[PDB]
């Protein structure tokens, strides 16, 4: 490849669902995604959105094109559907885990295809909505996706954690355990 | 339960900055790249049969061909020298280096950007390479990386870190 890789357009659209995503990537990281509903450029790092700009109209236009093309390619292929994959999750901390020192648990899920997934956290087996953030789907060279979920937490001798991934490629949600 | 996915991407490959650029666009239907522009060829090509209706058609229309070609400058070159040089290429985040004991010393190097880094163990002033095990680069997904470097041994042991965000190396003694 290269010293660097700019991906200056990623348009992903799916049917049914009418699910669109438009991102920019640089060296594997997400610069921004275009909030298609709000027509807004949403930067992964706030500072960046004040150092540079992107007109979200670009994203909307891109998705519109790909939406149309998907129609055409669906017919052109005799409506061949996507083949579901089984994703793979690994859990790890952002930092070395020190009791009573706040940290972030990361769930990385790879081999995501199609890009529809539930990634949610269990804290000793109850759903943990609070302090949870997720990334966009990042592109893989084999045209599957990866996605990360983050849980902020206070480490503790007394707490067990799971990353649970629900995907069509899996019959029932699957738990990835960390302690 | 039939599901369909389409992907379009414009990929810019840069070597020694913009001294060498390769521009590739890709049209993908359900993981099948079926048409591609590649600046190394200078025109669209069917990658598979699904792309046979498009590539030559697009090649016959001079404005399609001139516009796609020029994206090497108007997208790749423009982005790299403009926004990207003030954002991604200027970002420097210094690693945090902590040593702990697993038996083994573990040197955790966290929260740095960019990826280019050298972590070295030292026992009493000498660079050890034997019995040293580094992870791969771990991508946190948030414009930071981490690397954990194990020393199978424990003397004064020093974890030594080199990174573009640093005027001189971090040395952490144990």
């Amino acid at each position: 490849e290269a010293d660097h890789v700019g991906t200056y357009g990623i348009s992903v659209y799916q049917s049914p669902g009418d699910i669109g995503q438009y991102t920019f990537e640089f060296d594997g990281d997400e610069l921004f995604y275009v909030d298609l509903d709000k027509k807004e450029t949403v930067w992964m790092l706030p500072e960046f959105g004040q150092l540079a700009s992107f007109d979200p109209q670009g994203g909307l236009q891109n998705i519109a094109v790909v939406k149309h093309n998907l129609g055409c390619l669906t017919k052109r292929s005799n409506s061949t559907p996507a083949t579901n994959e089984a994703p793979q999750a690994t859990v790890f901390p952002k930092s070395p885990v020190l009791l009573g020192q706040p940290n972030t648990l990361i769930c990385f899920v790879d081999n995501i295809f199609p890009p529809v997934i539930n990634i949610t956290w269990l804290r000793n087996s109850k759903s943990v909505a609070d302090g949870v953030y997720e990334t966009s789907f990042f592109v893989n060279r084999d045209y599957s996706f990866h996605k990360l979920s983050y849980l902020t937490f206070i480490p503790s001798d007394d707490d067990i954690y799971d990353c649970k991934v629900e995907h069509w490629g899996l019959e029932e949600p699957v738990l990835k355990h960390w302690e | 339960e039939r599901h369909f996915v389409y992907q379009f991407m414009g990929e810019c490959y840069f070597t020694n900055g913009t001294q060498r650029i390769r521009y590739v666009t890709r049209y993908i239907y359900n993981r099948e790249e079926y048409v591609r522009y590649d600046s190394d060829v200078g025109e669209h090509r069917a990658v598979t049969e699904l792309g046979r209706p498009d590539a030559e058609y697009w090649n016959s229309q001079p404005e399609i061909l001139e516009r796609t070609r020029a994206e090497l400058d108007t997208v790749c070159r423009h982005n790299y020298e403009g926004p990207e040089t003030h954002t991604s290429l200027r970002r420097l985040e210094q690693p945090n280096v902590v040593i702990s004991l697993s038996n083994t010393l573990v040197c955790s190097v966290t929260d740095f950007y960019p990826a280019k880094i050298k972590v070295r163990w030292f026992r009493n002033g000498q660079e050890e390479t034997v019995g040293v095990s580094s992870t791969q680069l771990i991508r946190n997904g948030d414009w930071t990386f981490q690397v954990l470097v194990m020393l199978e041994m424990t003397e004064v042991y020093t974890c030594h870190v080199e990174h573009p965000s640093l005027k001189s190396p971090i040395t952490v003694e144990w």
């Binding site: 540079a52 790909v66 | 403009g82």
Partner: peptide, 13 residues
């Protein structure tokens, strides 16, 4: 500075 993007060709079917 402004990020600019590739534009996909639209297919007629």
């Amino acid at each position: 500075g402004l990020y600019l993007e590739a534009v996909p060709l639209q297919v007629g079917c």
